[PDB]
C-alpha cells in the first residue's frame, strides 16, 4: 500500500515477522517496525543466547574489523534477520532494504500512530503455550546492548502519556454515546436506513 | 597548420605551438592541465610561482610515486610537484602567444587559456648499460604543445 506500514514488534516471533516484512518491502512498501525489544524467539532463553554467542564467535581471523558486524541492538538484530531474508547484494534488494525502518521502543514519529499486528507471526497463535521462548530485549542486553534501561524508562513515559490520551478518548466516546441518546428523534430516520443496509447493529 | 579545437571566433583568438620540445610529457601535461582556463596574467604568475616552489601543479593522472605536499590542498588533490622545465617551456609559449596576440592587434589583458593540449612527440633513443652484458633503452619523452588564447572580460 501507499502509506507507511507500522508494525508493533511486541509478542511477534522473529523469523515469521521478518519474513512477512521482507515480502512486504520487496513489493515496494514502506514498513516501520517499532518496539523491536519485545520480539520473541521460540525456544528457551539459554539456547537462543548460545545461538547468538556462536554467531559472535564467527569473525574474520585475519582482520576482525572486516568480518561480520555483530549488531547488539534488538532493532539491528531484526534488521539483520530481514536482510538475511532479502537479496541484499542487488540494487532491488538494497532498495527494498532501504524501505525498512527498525526501532527500539517507539519514537516520536510513531508513538502517536496506530500500530498494526501480524497474526501469522504472533507468539500466542504460532507457539504452543507450554513451549519456552526468549525475549529479544533480554538477549540483546545480555549479549552487549547497552540501552535496555533507558529504553525501558522512555517506554514507561510513553505508556503514561498513552494512558492519559486513552482516558481522554474514552471520555469522548462516552460523551458521543450520550449525544446519540440525546438526539434520537432527529436521528432514527437515518439510523433505520443504516440498520436496513447492514451497518450499525 | 591544423589545430584541434579551432576557436569559435578566430578574430578574438591567438595561437601558439611547439613541436619536439625537450620536456617530459607527463609533467608538461599536468602543468598544462593546471594552467588551463586561467587568465594569461594569472597563468604567468602561477608558472613563475611553480618555478619558485611557492605554488604546485597537482599530479592527478601521472601520480605514481609522486609525493605529497601542503600546496596541493589549493586544488582538490593531495599530490603535487614543481616542474621547473615544464613551467619555463609553457612560459616561453605564453610569451610567444602574447606576441601573436599583439601582432593580431587584440589587447593581451583579457586573454584566457581556453585550449591547451600536450601530445607525445617521437621518442629519442639513448643507451644504458646493465649488469650482465645487457643493453637497455634510455628513451626520452618529448612532447608537442599547442594552446589557444581568447579575448573575454
Amino acid at each position: 500500500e501507499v502509506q507507511v506500514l507500522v508494525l508493533d514488534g511486541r509478542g511477534h516471533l522473529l523469523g515469521r515477522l521478518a519474513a512477512i516484512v521482507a515480502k512486504q518491502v520487496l513489493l515496494g512498501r514502506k514498513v516501520v517496525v517499532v518496539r523491536c525489544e519485545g520480539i520473541n524467539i521460540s525456544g528457551n532463553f539459554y539456547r537462543n543466547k548460545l545461538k547468538y554467542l556462536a554467531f559472535l564467535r564467527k569473525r574474520m581471523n585475519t582482520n576482525p574489523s572486516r568480518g561480520p558486524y555483530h549488531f547488539r541492538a534488538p532493532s539491528r538484530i531484526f534488521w539483520r534477520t530481514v536482510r538475511g531474508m532479502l537479496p541484499h547484494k542487488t540494487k532491488r534488494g538494497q532498495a527494498a532494504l532501504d524501505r525498512l525502518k527498525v526501532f527500539d521502543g517507539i519514537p516520536p514519529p510513531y508513538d502517536k500512530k496506530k500500530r498494526m499486528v501480524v497474526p501469522a507471526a504472533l507468539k500466542v497463535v504460532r507457539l504452543k503455550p507450554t513451549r519456552k521462548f526468549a525475549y529479544l530485549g533480554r538477549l540483546a542486553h545480555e549479549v552487549g546492548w547497552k540501552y535496555q534501561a533507558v529504553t525501558a524508562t522512555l517506554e514507561e513515559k510513553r505508556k503514561e502519556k498513552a494512558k492519559i490520551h486513552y482516558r481522554k478518548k474514552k471520555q469522548l466516546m462516552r460523551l458521543r454515546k450520550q449525544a446519540e441518546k440525546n438526539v434520537e428523534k432527529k436521528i432514527d430516520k437515518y439510523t433505520e436506513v443504516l440498520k436496513t443496509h447492514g451497518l450499525l447493529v | 597548420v591544423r589545430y584541434s579545437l579551432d576557436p569559435e571566433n578566430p578574430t578574438k583568438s591567438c595561437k601558439s605551438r611547439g613541436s619536439n620540445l625537450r620536456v617530459h610529457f607527463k609533467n608538461t601535461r599536468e602543468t598544462a592541465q593546471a594552467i588551463k582556463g586561467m587568465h594569461i596574467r594569472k597563468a604567468t604568475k602561477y608558472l613563475k610561482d611553480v618555478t619558485l616552489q611557492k605554488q604546485c601543479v597537482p599530479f592527478r593522472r601521472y601520480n605514481g610515486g609522486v609525493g605529497r605536499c601542503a600546496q596541493a590542498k589549493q586544488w582538490g588533490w593531495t599530490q603535487g610537484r614543481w616542474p621547473k622545465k615544464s613551467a619555463e617551456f609553457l612560459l616561453h609559449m605564453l610569451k610567444n602567444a602574447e606576441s601573436n596576440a599583439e601582432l593580431k592587434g587584440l589587447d593581451v589583458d583579457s586573454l584566457v587559456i581556453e585550449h591547451i593540449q600536450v601530445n607525445k612527440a617521437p621518442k629519442m633513443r639513448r643507451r644504458t648499460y646493465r649488469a650482465h652484458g645487457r643493453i637497455n633503452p634510455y628513451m626520452s619523452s618529448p612532447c608537442h604543445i599547442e594552446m589557444i588564447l581568447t579575448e573575454k572580460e
Binding site: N61, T62, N63, P64, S65, D104, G105, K146, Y147, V150, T151, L154 | -
Partner: protein, 402 residues
C-alpha cells in the same frame, strides 16, 4: 606444526590502532559515575607537565621493610593554573546514547579562550561569540536563555561545564587556551545547574577539584617517536648477526594459511604519540603558587614541615625545556605520559580506593631542587653562594659597585 617452545605474545592487542592520536589534549572518555547523594563537585582538570623531581618521605606501612623508614620517590610536577568556566552543556539519555541537548555560553569569554575557535588568530576579525554575547543584555535573549536553562533542568540527565586554561600565566609560547567539558557530579540536575550557573565566568582552582593524598587518573598523549621498526615498536627479538636482509625484523609474519597477514603480527609504523589513560596516580602535594602580600612568596612550594627553606618547586636553573612554575601545581607520584609542557587531563578515579596503598597519609620531609640541567649539586642559590664564596665576577662587579 606447533612452535617448539611456548612464549608469551609481544605487545598488547588492547592498544592495536598504534596510530598518531587524533587529538592532542587527551579526552576523558569516561567520567566517574554520578550519584545525587554527594555534594556538587567537578570531576576533572587540565594541567601541564612541568617536569620531574624526587622527594624524601617517611612511610607508614605496617609490616613492611620500609615501615617508619625514609624512601626516595620520583614525583612529577604538573602546573595547574585555575580553570575558567565559560559554558554549560546539558546531555539527554537516548536509546542511541548520550546526545548534546543544549549549550549555553557565558558572557565575556576571555580573549585566550576565543583563540581556540580560530585557526589563524593573526588574520581573524575576532568576531567569535560577538552576536551571541549580545543576548545576555537584551530582554529577548535573556528570556531565551532562561527557557534554555529550564529545558536543561527538566530534560537533561547529566550536565558538563566548558572550562579553559589560562595561557597568559604559563611560560609557554602558546597563547591558545585549551577548552574542555568537565562533568558536574553530585546532586539533582537543578542543583548542579544552579552551581554551574553561579560558577560562570569564575576561576576554579585545582584545590577545589582535587584533594591531598588521593589517587587520580592521568589522561594524555605520550611522547612521539616517529616511524619505528618492530624491534623498537613491539620489542620483538633481534635476529642473529648472520641474517642476510636485516636482523631488526620479524622473521615469520604468518603461515601459508590463512594466506593473509593477521592483524596480530608485529609490523613497523608509528610509535608514540598515543592516547593513554593511567589510573592510580597519588597526589603527594598540591602547590599553592606565588603570592604578593608584602613580598613575593615562593616558600609554600617546596618548603616542608622539616625543611623550612625559602625555596620554590622550581629547580636551580629552572625546569629544563619547560620554564618557571609560578601557579598552582600538583605533585603526582611517579611518571606521567607526555613530553614536557604537554597538556594533561587529571580525572577523578572511577574505582573505590580501599587498599592500604590508597588512603595513606603523605607527609614529605624533603623535595629535591637541584639543577636538572646537568648533575646539579646545590639546592638553592644561597646555599651555592655560601659554599663557593665570592667568585671573580662577583669581585669585578663589587669593584664597580664601590
Amino acid at each position: 606444526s606447533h612452535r617448539k617452545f611456548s612464549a608469551p605474545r609481544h605487545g598488547s592487542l588492547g592498544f592495536l590502532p598504534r596510530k598518531r592520536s587524533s587529538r592532542h589534549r587527551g579526552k576523558v572518555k569516561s567520567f566517574p559515575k554520578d550519584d545525587p547523594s554527594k555534594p556538587v563537585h567537578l570531576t576533572a582538570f587540565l594541567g601541564y607537565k612541568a617536569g620531574m623531581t624526587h622527594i624524601v618521605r617517611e612511610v607508614d606501612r605496617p609490616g613492611s621493610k620500609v615501615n617508619k623508614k625514609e624512601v626516595v620517590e620520583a614525583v612529577t610536577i604538573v602546573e595547574t593554573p585555575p580553570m575558567v568556566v565559560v559554558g554549560i552543556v546539558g546531555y539527554v539519555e537516548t536509546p542511541r546514547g548520550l546526545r548534546t541537548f543544549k549549550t549555553v555560553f557565558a558572557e565575556h569569554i576571555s580573549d585566550e579562550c576565543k583563540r581556540r575557535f580560530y585557526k589563524n588568530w593573526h588574520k581573524s576579525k575576532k568576531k567569535a561569540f560577538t552576536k551571541y554575547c549580545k543576548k545576555w543584555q537584551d530582554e529577548d535573549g535573556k528570556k531565551q536563555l532562561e527557557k534554555d536553562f529550564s529545558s536543561m533542568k527538566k530534560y537533561c540527565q547529566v550536565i558538563r561545564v566548558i572550562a579553559h586554561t589560562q595561557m597568559r600565566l604559563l611560560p609557554l609560547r602558546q597563547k591558545k587556551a585549551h577548552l574542555m567539558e568537565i562533568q558536574v557530579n553530585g546532586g539533582t540536575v537543578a542543583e548542579k545547574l544552579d552551581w554551574a550557573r553561579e560558577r560562570l565566568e569564575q576561576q576554579v582552582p585545582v584545590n577545589q577539584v582535587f584533594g591531598q593524598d588521593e589517587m587520580i587518573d592521568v589522561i594524555g598523549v605520550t611522547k612521539g617517536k616517529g616511524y619505528k621498526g618492530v624491534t623498537s615498536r613491539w620489542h620483538t627479538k633481534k635476529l642473529p648477526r648472520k641474517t642476510h636482509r636485516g636482523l631488526r625484523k620479524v622473521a615469520c609474519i604468518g603461515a601459508w594459511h590463512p594466506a593473509r597477514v593477521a592483524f596480530s603480527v608485529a609490523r613497523a609504523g608509528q610509535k608514540g604519540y598515543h592516547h593513554r589513560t593511567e589510573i592510580n596516580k597519588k597526589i603527594y602535594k598540591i602547590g599553592q603558587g606565588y603570592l604578593i602580600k608584602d613580598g613575593k612568596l615562593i616558600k609554600n612550594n617546596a618548603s616542608t614541615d622539616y625543611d623550612l627553606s625559602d625555596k620554590s618547586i622550581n629547580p636551580l636553573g629552572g625546569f629544563v625545556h619547560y620554564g618557571e612554575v609560578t601557579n598552582d601545581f600538583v605533585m603526582l607520584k611517579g611518571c606521567v605520559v607526555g613530553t614536557k609542557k604537554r597538556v594533561l587531563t587529571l580525572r577523578k578515579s572511577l574505582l573505590v580506593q580501599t587498599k592500604r596503598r590508597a588512603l595513606e597519609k603523605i607527609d614529605l620531609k624533603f623535595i629535591d631542587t637541584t639543577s636538572k640541567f646537568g648533575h646539579g649539586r646545590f639546592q638553592t642559590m644561597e646555599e651555592k653562594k655560601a659554599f663557593m664564596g665570592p667568585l671573580k665576577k662577583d669581585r669585578i662587579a663589587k669593584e664597580e659597585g664601590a
